Amino acid sequence: RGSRRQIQRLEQLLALYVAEIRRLQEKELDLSELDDPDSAYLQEARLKRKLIRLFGRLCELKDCSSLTGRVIEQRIPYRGTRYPEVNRRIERLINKPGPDTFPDYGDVLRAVEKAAARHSLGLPRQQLQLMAQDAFRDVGIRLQERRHLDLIYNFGCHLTDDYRPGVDPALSDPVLARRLRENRSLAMSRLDEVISKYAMLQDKS
């Protein structure tokens, strides 16, 4: 157990960092400020890093883990094949900690072949390939879902915490809604256009 007095001091400091982050979040940056390495956005980012380091040290002091309760922390189970060796290996593959855990098909197939060879399951190559494709598909869905949820449950700040979609001004203002509709048609075209641009470039090369 950590020193009570020191925990208290560090927690007061933590609250102070939070107050300053909220202050910086509400700063209005003009165009020249957006060109500035010392802008409030960068000040705020650095303060967030400072804060996360202090949180880590407080976790040291209370002998707790570093877990914050993120959605991406929650384990995704996979029972998908008829061979539990393969299933375990796939659960392993998809449950690595961190924002970067997203296997490609090769990773999945390697896990399948590895569990096969390791446990001498005698599975031939096309059965292996089919198992890997089915598995990859399954885990793809689950990983994308976990990230989406991690995003939408963790988004924004106190300024957006009262957002609800029924309050969209556009719902009560047909002129505004019309302009937004026009914008949306433009947005979709622009995105298609940039995608096509780089495809065309790939071809012409």
Partner 1 sequence: KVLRDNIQGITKPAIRRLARRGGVKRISGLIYEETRGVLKVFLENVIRDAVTYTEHAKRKTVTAMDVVYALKRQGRTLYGFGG
Partner 2 sequence: KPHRYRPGTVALREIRRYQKSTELLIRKLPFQRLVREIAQDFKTDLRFQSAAIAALQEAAEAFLVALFEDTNLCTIHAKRVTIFPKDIQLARRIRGER
Contacts with partner 2, residue ranges (CB under 8 A): 11-12, 14-15, 18, 21, 24-31, 34-35, 37, 39-42, 44-45, 48-49, 51-52, 55, 58-59, 62-65, 67-70, 99, 102, 104-106, 109, 129, 133, 136-137, 140, 143-144, 147, 150-151, 154-157, 159-160, 188, 191-192, 195-196, 198-199, 201-203
Q: Backbone phi, then psi, for 79, in 5-degree steps?
A: -100, 10
Q: Answer whether 82's CB lies under 8 Å from 21's CB.
A: no
Nearest to residue 114, comparing CAs of 130, 99, 102, 132?
132
Does residue 104 interact with partner 1 by CB under 8 A? yes
Nearest to residue 109, comparing CAs of 82, 133, 141?
133
**Min separation Cβ 78 and partner 2, Å:** 16
Q: Cα separations (Å) of 10 from 1, 7, 61, 147?
A: 15, 5, 10, 31
DSSP reduced 3-state for 139: helix
Does residue 174 interact with partner 1 by CB under 8 A? no
Q: Using the 8-state DSSP alphabet, how is residue 170 labeled? A: G
List contacts with partner 1 (CB under 8 A): 25, 28, 99-100, 102-104, 106-107, 148, 151-152, 155-157, 159-160, 163-165, 168-170, 173, 176, 179-180, 183-184, 186-187, 190-191, 193-195, 197-198, 201-202, 205
